[PDB]
Ligand binder design. Sequence first.
Ligand SMILES: Nc1nc2c(ncn2[C@@H]2O[C@@H]3COP(=O)(O)O[C@H]4[C@@H](O)[C@H](n5cnc6c(=O)[nH]c(N)nc65)O[C@@H]4COP(=O)(O)O[C@H]3[C@H]2O)c(=O)[nH]1
Lengths: 187, 187
Amino acid sequence: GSNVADGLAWSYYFGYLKFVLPELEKQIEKTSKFRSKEKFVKKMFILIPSNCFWDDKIPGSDYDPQNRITFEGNTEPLEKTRGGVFLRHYKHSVYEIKDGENEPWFCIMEYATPLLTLYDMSVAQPGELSREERDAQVVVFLRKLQDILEGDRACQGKYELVTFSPDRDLADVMLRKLKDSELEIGG
Amino acid sequence: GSNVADGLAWSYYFGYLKFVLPELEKQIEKTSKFRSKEKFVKKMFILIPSNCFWDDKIPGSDYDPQNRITFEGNTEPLEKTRGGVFLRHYKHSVYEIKDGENEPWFCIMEYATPLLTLYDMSVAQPGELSREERDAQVVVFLRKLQDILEGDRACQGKYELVTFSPDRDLADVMLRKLKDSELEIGG
Ligand SMILES: Nc1nc2c(ncn2[C@@H]2O[C@@H]3COP(=O)(O)O[C@H]4[C@@H](O)[C@H](n5cnc6c(=O)[nH]c(N)nc65)O[C@@H]4COP(=O)(O)O[C@H]3[C@H]2O)c(=O)[nH]1
């Protein structure tokens, strides 16, 4: 078959999200700077650009035209060996997002890395995955990932999927989602 | 859909095999000990047990009942960042395989890591993937991986897929494949 998105979503979960998401808040709290910070939403914001592509660096990127996003630092690494085959270390990037004259937000942002495979396939093997087929697979990936994560009680409230077109301002998108997050001051 | 194997094979390729396989021989040759060794087949032997499972350590494992496999060392690491999201280091394990009184072989062996996801699914989400459905997905994974790798000229002669039942002696299986490999003394 050609429905690559199903496999991408399941491996994204079992090979990463399943064990990083429940532990994320605790990992963040291991850093005093992060304990001290208010307006720090602890959910992982998983970024899903409709074009399966992004600048390697989020701050100042085409998705950040107003330069309101700044890299703050990384969380303390989680160590895990995968079936005794290879060793992995997992850590996440914290970003500051400006909110005018108010206190800026801190948040966890990450592009959905399985999208790299969709993009690579469309460029290296166009016969297997056309641009239009890639577009559709993004949607399939999103819907399956939603089903998987929503089926895991341990992941509840630990993430937020963010879909957007490449013409959008990520800072604006994120600011709105951060304000709509459950986190209140002192929380 | 439920055909997870397709996605597993494509990401295994684009996220790993596509860039490690063409460089493998060169990476191995960076170590003098490996340059000096004869009967060192430079192909990556990708192990695909029919049950999607293995002991973390290959030497002395249930797949090595005669204790003829020994860990020798790792290849020099390859560094690569994945879309600016996370940093990876790739390296491979070299094993010695006893050949009676003759000179023992050196080889590169590693289990097909996407099988971890198939196994994890069958145990954690049996409703999504039954034992019997997992068995079938192994076959789908194998055949799709074959199609992908055979379609990449840069990967030609750089790998060998090894399928076996868990009751088999991996040392016997490997000895057979090493002798049948193209590599000749001084090659
Ligand atoms: N943001 C973020 N995302 C992460 C991280 N770790 C994994 N992911 C995402 O989850 C996908 C599946 O990871 P996997 O279970 O290890 O599945 C792996 C694994 O089975 C295999 N593979 C990758 N690296 C190695 C390796 O070094 N050695 C071996 N033997 N297999 C590898 O290729 C498969 C697909 O690799 P990926 O393309 O990278 O695809 C990964 C990646 O998109 C992380 O630390 N941060």
